[PDB]
Design a protein around this ligand. Structure first.
Ligand SMILES: Cc1nnc2n1-c1ccccc1C(c1ccccc1)=N[C@H]2NC(=O)OCc1ccccc1
Ligand SMILES: Cc1nnc2n1-c1ccccc1C(c1ccccc1)=N[C@H]2NC(=O)OCc1ccccc1
Lengths: 105, 105
């Protein structure tokens, strides 16, 4: 019921979102040219991974899925500079995530 | 019911927590010697403010209170360096926040 909601309502909205594109797949540190990314960020996470996990019944509790969303956003804030656009993008998506989590069954 | 839960269960646990102390009052940029804090962080938030707001029935929806917790943690990640202790402290508290939010009525 709760994981159904996270998949059917929360992920549906965030995946579609205008600012979703950077978070749809794992950060490729080599392509992006970020040699220090995996030195700073120890637990990478992204929406593609969360989506697969929801589809394949990976999670046992809603909170596990919620923690993955949180880790995704947090990594972005920790690695990037405050003035970066990605930071505003993460904030916008996280706000919507928390709003819908408040309405979870 | 939901705001009661946020006050009685969520705030109760986080306020007591070992790592709560830096977040119990607004960041005093002058005392802490952070001249650029309010240039970078545009919406300051802290647990003291959230606690007063819960006590005084300030909030209309649980999500408003949840957004304040999120803003508090996010500010910490954006302003501080990745290796700072406060960053680990925020992560620990945020994990507990999200865990209890998953059990909200
Ligand atoms: C997700 C995520 N998390 N971080 C990043 N993405 C990301 C993932 C996939 C694609 C893009 C991005 C964007 C991005 C997103 C949107 C707009 C602009 C940028 N930015 C990436 N970070 C970056 O390029 O760091 C700059 C840097 C480089 C070297 C050293 C220090 C700092
Ligand atoms: C909350 C919160 N958010 N940021 C900070 N606190 C905070 C609030 C109240 C009290 C302490 C702290 C601690 C803290 C907390 C715990 C342990 C260590 C530190 N650190 C503060 N930041 C800081 O000193 O920046 C270093 C800096 C200075 C100048 C320039 C650049 C960077």
């Amino acid at each position: 019921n709760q994981l159904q909601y996270l998949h059917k309502v929360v992920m549906k909205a965030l995946w579609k979102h205008q600012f979703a594109w950077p978070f749809r797949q794992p950060v490729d540190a080599v392509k992006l040219g970020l040699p220090d990314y995996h030195k700073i960020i120890k637990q990478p996470m992204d929406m593609g991974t969360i989506k697969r996990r929801l589809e394949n019944n990976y999670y046992w509790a809603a909170s596990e899925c919620m923690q993955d969303f949180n880790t995704m956003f947090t990594n972005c804030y920790i690695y990037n500079k405050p003035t970066d656009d990605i930071v505003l993008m993460a904030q916008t998506l996280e706000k919507i995530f928390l709003q819908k989590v408040a309405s979870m069954p």
